[PDB]
Amino acid sequence: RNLMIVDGTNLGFRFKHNNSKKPFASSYVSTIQSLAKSYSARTTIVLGDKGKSVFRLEHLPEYKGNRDEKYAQRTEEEKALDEQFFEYLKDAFELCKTTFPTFTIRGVEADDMAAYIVKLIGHLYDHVWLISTDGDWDTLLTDKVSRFSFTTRREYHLRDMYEHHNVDDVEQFISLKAIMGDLGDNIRGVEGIGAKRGYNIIREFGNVLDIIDQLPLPGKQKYIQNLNASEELLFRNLILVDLPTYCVDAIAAVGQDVLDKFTKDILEIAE
Ligand SMILES: [Zn+2]
């Protein structure tokens, strides 16, 4: 029997993209019942997001400050549609409450909880299935932990780290994010360095903490020059992207008590 951790808000947004008018709460859970059946999910855990990441906002005050700007310039109809979605989502998460253990810790991101659960109980199962279209969740991939994106109807395994992410492992994917950047979450990257360039640098010099040791790096390229002055940016981004290493801190940032209850609840389910 396997473990299934769903990315609630993420799946919800997929139901929005398919249709912004029609409610989805019913299909949502049913779809999750189908997936659990297929992946012999003996245990199923639904997780959604609730608020900005307290842990991230600390190391980067402007973290995700771009998604706010986008809502500021939305018309009445747009903000309306947006509000609808979030309503239908709240309903969707309520429906789940009747079938699957659901969780929402305001101030903690979903990936932070999924990563904490994976660590905490991942060993109690034969496999762990992450249900998300978000490839950032691929930082949890192991030979016993895999992801499944509906948008592509494809499942992603560790061996697929290069084709899908331009890197070779979980540590390189973290270093690439920290070096490259992440527009979607509004995280500044080394100006001039992208996926292909970032990889090559990593392949030749190693992970971030290894590249910091070697700065300045040889080369007369501007991105190689920009790199040599991003040390501060690198240390920062690394914390924001290194999910498996900072997930316990990310949750504890909202209370040594909230972390305790969530720990108790998980194991109280994986038993
Ligand atoms: Zn997420």
Description of the structure:
- With 271 residues, this protein is an alpha/beta fold.
- It has two domains: 162-241, 5' to 3' exonuclease, C-terminal subdomain (DNA polymerase, domain 1, Orthogonal Bundle); 1-160 and 242-267, 3-Layer(aba) Sandwich (Rossmann fold), CATH 3.40.50.1010.
- 54% of the residues lie in helices and 10% in strands.
- It has a six-stranded mixed β-sheet, with helices on both faces.
- Strand 5 and strand 6 (154-156) form a beta hairpin.
- Helix 8 crosses helix 9 and helix 8 crosses helix 12.
- The radius of gyration is 19 Å and the shape is globular.
- The two termini are 13 Å apart.
- The site of zinc ion has 5 residues, from helix 6.
- Residues 63-97 are annotated as: Helical arch.
- Keywords: DNA replication, DNA-binding, Early protein, Endonuclease, Exonuclease, Hydrolase, Magnesium, Metal-binding, Nuclease, Potassium, Viral DNA replication.
- InterPro entries: 5-3_exonucl_a-hlix_arch_N, 5-3_exonuclease, 5-3_exonuclease_C_sf, DNA_polI_H3TH, FEN, FEN_D15-like, HhH2, PIN-like_dom_sf.
- DNA binds at residue 64.
- Residues 171-244 form the 5'-3' exonuclease domain.
